[PDB]
Every structure is written in structure tokens, then in C-alpha cells.
Amino acid sequence: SMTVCQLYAKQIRHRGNVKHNTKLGRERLMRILEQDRLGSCPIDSVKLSDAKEWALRMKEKGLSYKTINNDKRSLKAAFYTAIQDDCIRKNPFDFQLSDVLDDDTEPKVPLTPAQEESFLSFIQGDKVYQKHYDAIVILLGTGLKISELCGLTDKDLDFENRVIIVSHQLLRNTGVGYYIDEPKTQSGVRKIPMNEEVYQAFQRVIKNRKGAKPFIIDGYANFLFLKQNGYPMTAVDYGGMFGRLVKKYNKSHEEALPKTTTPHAMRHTFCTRLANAGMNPKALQYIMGHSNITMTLNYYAHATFDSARAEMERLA
Amino acid sequence: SMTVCQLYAKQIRHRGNVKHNTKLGRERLMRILEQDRLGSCPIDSVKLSDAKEWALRMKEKGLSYKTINNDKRSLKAAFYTAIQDDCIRKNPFDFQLSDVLDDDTEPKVPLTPAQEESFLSFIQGDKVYQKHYDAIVILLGTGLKISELCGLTDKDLDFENRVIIVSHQLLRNTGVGYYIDEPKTQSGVRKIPMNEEVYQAFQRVIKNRKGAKPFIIDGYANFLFLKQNGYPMTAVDYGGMFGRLVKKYNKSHEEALPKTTTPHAMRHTFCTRLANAGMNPKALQYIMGHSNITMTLNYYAHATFDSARAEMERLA
DNA sequence: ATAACCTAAAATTTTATAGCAAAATTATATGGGATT
DNA sequence: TCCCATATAATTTTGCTATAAAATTTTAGGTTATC
């Protein structure tokens, strides 16, 4: 625990009950510390300027603002543990990154209703990506995360009541392969109603499903969305497909789609479209699956005096 | 700072830039420590068990649950600074008060629309409180805090646009007397529109204003709402008037008003009535002048799967 | 002749917060004054 | 008894920022299917 690499390594051991993607993210930061001059510095000599100069080298290395901010929080928790053990006194990472680096992050812009209909029309007619038409319709109409969509099976659907039961996700990583992840409490389980377009999409998925290879993981089988090899789709498989789909859309249309048109942009467009329509915020929170209500309110536009004037006159 | 009273006294001297009401509240807690055995104990001799026995003595003293929880927080921050500087390792106040004592908080039930009409009808038809009719109509139609209403002057009204510019408040305390409080940044300044009832209420206030004694403070003059002595109203003057008004109302009406029918209850009724009507939460946050949006979302009812399904089908 | 899929690897984004008191509002004891 | 004002006391309302996990997306290198 003397050096920063030894301090962060001891932090991983103290808090080890983590998921697989967390282990990959921690090792990513460990490789950063080992390749950086800060990794070999004794923790009792890391000053406030040393931590700020680390963020400068991270931005010069090429890392985005949110990455340096997330890695700083990981390092701040490590030094906070050393303060509890009286190894040091002050935390060198107790500063604002905005005072050292400028947040040059492109804001994620959702799809307008005009772009949303032009996008689905191109997908339905294209002979290469029409097989993904139903999934993108379901994503735009439910706000499901990409791994939640990949984890949907026949037992997760209630066609008698037109309700989607979101209770798990289907993840895949190098080495471990597929694995099912479920929330610890029932708060992570939510039910989403299906509209007419979403209902017709699920029926066309089941009626046109073929070539499914044997695949049972944690009692889950008969997945709805499969790859060309008969095995269920994953987040990486959808992300790569969206890259080729948007690039092909831009070549056939004069106005190009936003550069951030990813599977999560369907979730961002879903929450924004319902928020602009005046949906109940806590009801929209349940459909989205957010832990707190402040996270859902980020999708509501900033209110001014003129907007609140006509809004109060609307309910007078 | 070796004893609890000396530690909390050093905590007051550290963060001195406070308001007069804060100095009264800190003195109210200092008298609590001086009149309790846990005030003269050394900081290195107080464990977590001594904090639980102290909270039980405050509950036996008759203090409210929120009162003890707020005072236990001031003591928690007093020992938090002690751990950073003085010889201290563990904080004896790092515990949840709900485990020691129960919460006897009474729910603040808002006013139903039928009660408000009957409440405003009694005020108009009463020869003693009819002079306060226009003030209460404004509170229910704008949601102003009671000290934001007392600070309203002629220059704060824009009858050309029917806008209430809320930029300050008028407070009074024993010794200091009247004093104007202004926010630090422009975020604390809000603009509230006037409806037909609020507009006609402000017109009757100015047209019937008489007996205003000379009163200029921090450039503010010509206050709208005055006492019978010619000086502007305060929160205590409206609070005591409401207590006598509600008591007289319950003598003549069968369905008695809630025990918490206070000037703030008018603000609570204003916010809850707009949230139930489907108002934009960020537009409601601006009219209320809240810092964060979590407080505004508390007025929205908890959503279930049935309520969320109805909202999705309403916007499908 | 070019995408179109697949996967290990690398990068980025999404997700997630009470409470480490200030500072307001309201109730009460008290007394002089106006009503029933 | 009720109104009013006020010092005192009690109670309620209010305010700021994440002491990272765990997802999703992009990319380099390669093979395979369709323009």
C-alpha cells in the first residue's frame, strides 16, 4: 500500500465482490497507473498538484473527460481508505476536475420524431437490415437497454396482457462467454406495457425465428433475438450493426443522423419523447428503470419563465 | 475543544458566516448541551452508546423527532471536524436515528378544493379577518413563502405584465428587528405570473392601503401588507392570525380544517394542486423557487405499474 | 470488388445520493386592549 | 372570551454534491457473403 499501484491494488482486495465488467475496468485503470509516473509514487508524498498533473497527462494521453473523472473517483476512494487507516492525512484527489480540464464532451442528442420515422422506413425497406426492424421498433417503444433486449425470452412475454417482464439481462465477455445477470432486489424488476407496434414486432420475431441452436443458461432458453450462428445477440453485436446501419443511412439520405445514434440512443429517444409529451415523471421512471427520480428528470427540458407562464395558464 | 460544549462552540466559531436565525438555533442547541450530562463530557470519552442514551433523553424531554435528528447532525459535524484535526478516530453520531426512536411525524394533509372555497368564503364574510382575504388568495394562487409575501413592495409588482418579481424577503427577530434577506446569485430570483384572482387581489391591497408609517430599509419601501401599527407584516404576525382564524373557522363549520392549516399550508396546497393536474415538474420547480428538483418531485404521487400503464396507453 | 459479421481488445458512457445543519416557519407564555 | 403584539421557545422546511461500479460503444484484425 506504499505506492499508488499498491494502494489501488489493496483497494480492489478490500472491495472485491464486483461483477466481471468491473474487474475489466479496474485492470484498465491498473494498466494506466503502471504506465504512468504516479503509479510508483509513495502515497505519503502525493500532493494535491501531483493528482492534478495526473489528470493533465490523462487528457494528453487521449482519454475522454468522463474517463479521467471516473478514474479520479476510483483513486479518491483508494486514498480515502488510506486516510481511514491513518496511512496519510489529506486526500490529494479532493478537487474539481472542471478547474483543471474543460469538459469537451459532445452532448447526446435524441432523435426527433421526423428522424425516428425516416429511420424505421429505411430499415424496413433495406434488404440487409430489415431483420433488425422489429428490435429497433421494440427499443424505440420500450426504452429497454441493449442487454435487457438480448435477455428477453418467450417466458418473459405476456401476450395475454401485452406486458414485458424485465427481470434480467444477457451479457457476454471474452473468456467467460454468455452469462445471466439478475438484480439483487425486486426493485430492479419492472413491467413494460406493449403498444400496437411493439406487440406486432414481438409476434413477427417469434413467427420468423429459425435456426436456434441449443442454448440454456441459468434456466433461460428460447431467446427472441439471435445472431446468424443461431446464438443470442449481444450488446457488441448490436453496436457494430448500428455503426454499419447509420453509415449506410447517411449515404442514402441528404441529412445525416446524429453521430451518437447507438442502441442506447433509442432509450434516450424513448425517454425524451415521452417526457416532451407531458408524461408523469414517476411513471416514466418506472418504465425506464432508474433508481432515483432525479435521473429521469434529466430528460425534461429546462424550464424558463415563459414556459411556466403558459403552463400555469394551461391549468388555470 | 476537549469537551462537547467546547467542541460545538469551536464549530460555531469556524463557520461564522451564518444568519441570525442560525445563531438562534445554534444557541438553542448550546443550551441543550449545557443542560445535559453529555455536554460536559470529554470528546475522547464519548462512545456510540453515549449518543443513543442522549437521544433517548431528548425524546423524554418532549422534543420532536425532526428536532432531535437535526441536533444530532450538528453534533455529528462537530465530531467530524474533530476527527480531521483533534485526536479522534470514530464518530459516535454515525448512526440512524430511526433505530433508536420511532418517527411520530403527522402527515401534512393539504386542503381539498371544497375546503379552500369554504375557507375563503368564511374569511370574506368575517368582519375580523376579511382584511386578510386578499393576502390568502395570493398565497393560494402563487405559492409564495410567508416572508416572501411580507417583502413585496410596489416596485416588486409588474401590473403591465402581471408578474410577481420575487427577489428578496422581509424578516424580523427580537433585537435586530426588520431586516431584508437577499439571495447570493440570481438563481434565487423568480418571476410568478398573476391570474385573474391574484391580479384583482393585489389591486384591492394597494387601493385599500392606509396608515403606512415611514419605513425604509435597504432601499425597500412601500410594503403592501401592513399591521395595524402601520409597519409591515411578519411571519409571526400571519402565523398567529392563522391560528386564531382556523380556530374560529372550526367553531362554525362541521368538517374542521387540518391542525396544520398554516401560511405554509397555502404553499403546500398550491404546489400539490398543480402536480396532480399534470404540470411540468421543472416548470413547477421554477414557480416554487426550489434549489434542487427532488423537493418538487415529492409532491408527485408514487407511481405503480397500473398508473404507469395508463400513462403509456394515454400517450400511445 | 466492398461491405458485412465476428471477436478480442480498448475505450467511453451510463448509472447512482443521503444528510458530515443552515434557516426558515410555527407554537406558546404574557400582557395590554378591544369585544360578546 | 377574543385580538393583537412580542419575547421566547419549539418545530418544520430547506439545500449540495458522487470517497466508481457496471454497464455500452468503438476499434483493430480477420473471414465470409453480396453488390
Author numbering:
A (entry chain A), B (entry chain B): 81 to 396
Q: How do the authors describe this structure?
A:
The Tn1549 conjugative transposon propagates resistance to the antibiotic vancomycin used for severe drug-resistant infections. The DNA cleavage and joining reactions required for CTn transposition are carried out by a transposase enzyme called integrase (Int). Most known CTns, including the Tn916-like family, have Y-transposases that use a conserved tyrosine residue to attack a phosphorous atom in the DNA backbone. Int contains 3 functional domains: an arm-binding domain (AB), a core DNA binding domain (CB), and a catalytic domain (CAT).
We obtained crystals of Int82N bound to a 44 bp double-stranded DNA (dsDNA) oligonucleotide mimicking the CI. The DNA (named CI5) represents a sequence from previous in vivo studies in Clostridium and contains the conserved left and right 11 bp long AT-rich imperfect inverted repeats (IRL and IRR) that mark the ends of Tn1549, connected by a 5 bp homoduplex crossover region (atagc) (Domingo et al., 2005) as in the transposon integration substrate in the recipient cell. The resulting 2.8 Å structure revealed a dimer of Int82N bound to one CI5 DNA. Each protein molecule covers one IR and the crossover region is located at the center between the two subunits. The CB and CAT domains form a clamp around the DNA and the two protein subunits face each other in a near-perfect 2-fold symmetric assembly. The CI5 DNA molecule assumes a nearly straight conformation and the double helix is unwound and largely distorted at the crossover region. Distortion is initiated precisely at the boundary of the IR sequence, where R153 from the Int CB domain, invades the DNA and flips out the first base of the crossover region into an extra-helical position. At both IRs, the R153 sidechain stacks with the terminal adenine base of the respective IR (A5′/A5 in IRL/IRR) and disrupts the continuity of base stacking. In the active site of each Int subunit, several conserved residues are assembled around the DNA scissile phosphate, together forming a catalytic pocket characteristic of tyrosine recombinases. These include the catalytic triad K225 (natively R), H344, and R347, as well as H370.
